[PDB]
Design a protein around this ligand. Structure first.
Ligand SMILES: [Cl-]
Length: 303
C-alpha cells in the first residue's frame, strides 16, 4: 500500500536516517482553529475543521500554533485577535498522546506570538513559553532537547521539535532556537539562514495573495525543492491564504481551489522533494479532486 493509505503512521515507514528537512511533511495553517463555530467570524478566522488528534491521524506532522500570552504562565491559541477556545497545554497533551500511540512519528510545532499579551502579563511571550512550557516538568521528555541543528528522524521521533517564530530565544534546540530566531519577511517568498547559519530556510508565506498569484508562488517554490538535494536547505510552503472580503470569500473557499490544484501538480511530479507544505483545511476532501495531504505523504521515496 502507498504511504497515504496509512496516514496515521507514515513516518514509521521511512528511513529514520533522513533529516526532517528532507522529508516532505504536510502542515496545517493555524492548526487550532477547528474550534470556531461562528459562521461570520469563521469566513476569515477559521482555517481547519479537524481537531489536533484527527489531523495527526490524517497524517499532519507540522503544526502552526500562534498564540497570545493570557497570564504569566499561560499561552492561549489564537488567530490574531481571535481566541481559539483553548490553551497551549491542550495541543501539547494531544500531541503527547498521539506520539505515545505512534512512537515513530515526529511532530514539528511552530510557535509564534499573534496578539498582544493580556495587560496583567509581566513577562515576555518567549519567556512564558520557555519557562512554563518548554522547561515545565509536566512536559518533560515531550520536546526534542538535542543539540543537533539539523536533526534526523531517528533522534526526533516520539518528540515535538520546536520551530521557533518567537524571535530570539534562550531555548537551544529546534529550528531557529538561538538568540537571533528566524528573520521572517511579511507576505513574501524569502530565504534566511537559521541556527547560527547551519540551515538555509526558504519560505513562501505570501498570505495576502489573491489565489491565482498564490498558486504561482506555491508552484515556484515547489519547483525549487524538486531539484534541490541539499539537506541543509529547509522549505516551508504555505498554501493557505487570507480571506478576500465578502461572506463565502472564505479561506475554505480558496483552499478548495488551491489544495486540489497543488495536489495535482505534486502527483504529476512523482517522487520529487516538496518541502514542508502548510495547508488550510488539512484532510478536507472533494469528490473528484486530488487530496493535498495524501499527495505530500506519497511524494516521499521509500529506500
Ligand atoms: Cl467561535
Amino acid at each position: 500500500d502507498s504511504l497515504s493509505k496509512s496516514p496515521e503512521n507514515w513516518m514509521s515507514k521511512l528511513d529514520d536516517g533522513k533529516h526532517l528537512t528532507e522529508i516532505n511533511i504536510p502542515g496545517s495553517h493555524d492548526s487550532g482553529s477547528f474550534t470556531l463555530k461562528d459562521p461570520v467570524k469563521s469566513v476569515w478566522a477559521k482555517t481547519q475543521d479537524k481537531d489536533y488528534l484527527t489531523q495527526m491521524k490524517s497524517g499532519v506532522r507540522f503544526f502552526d500554533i500562534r498564540g497570545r500570552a493570557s497570564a504569566d504562565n499561560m499561552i492561549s491559541v489564537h488567530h490574531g485577535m481571535v481566541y481559539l477556545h483553548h490553551e497551549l497545554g491542550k495541543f501539547l497533551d494531544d500531541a503527547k498522546y498521539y506520539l505515545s500511540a505512534y512512537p515513530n512519528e515526529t511532530i514539528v510545532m511552530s510557535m509564534k506570538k499573534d496578539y498582544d499579551s493580556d495587560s496583567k502579563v509581566t513577562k515576555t511571550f518567549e519567556e512564558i513559553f520557555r519557562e512554563y512550557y518548554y522547561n515545565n516538568p509536566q512536559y518533560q521528555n515531550l520536546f526534542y532537547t538535542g543539540s543537533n541543528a539539523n536533526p534526523t528522524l531517528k533522534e526526533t521521533k516520539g518528540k515535538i521539535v520546536l520551530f521557533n517564530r518567537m524571535g530570539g530565544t534562550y531555548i537551544k534546540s529546534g529550528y531557529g532556537a538561538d538568540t537571533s530566531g528566524i528573520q521572517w519577511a511579511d507576505n513574501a517568498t524569502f530565504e534566511t539562514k537559521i541556527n547560527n547559519g547551519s540551515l538555509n530556510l526558504k519560505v513562501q508565506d505570501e498570505y495576502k495573495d489573491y489565489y491565482d498569484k498564490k498558486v504561482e508562488a506555491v508552484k515556484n517554490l515547489l519547483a525549487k525543492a524538486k531539484t534541490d538535494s541539499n539537506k541543509d536547505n529547509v522549505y516551508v510552503n504555505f498554501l493557505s491564504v487570507a480571506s478576500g472580503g465578502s461572506a463565502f470569500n472564505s479561506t475554505y473557499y480558496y483552499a478548495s481551489y488551491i489544495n486540489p490544484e497543488i495536489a495535482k501538480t505534486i502527483k504529476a511530479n512523482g517522487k520529487a522533494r516538496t518541502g514542508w507544505l502548510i495547508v488550510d483545511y488539512a484532510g478536507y476532501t472533494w469528490p473528484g479532486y486530488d487530496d493535498i495531504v495524501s499527495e505530500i505523504i506519497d511524494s516521499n521515496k521509500l529506500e
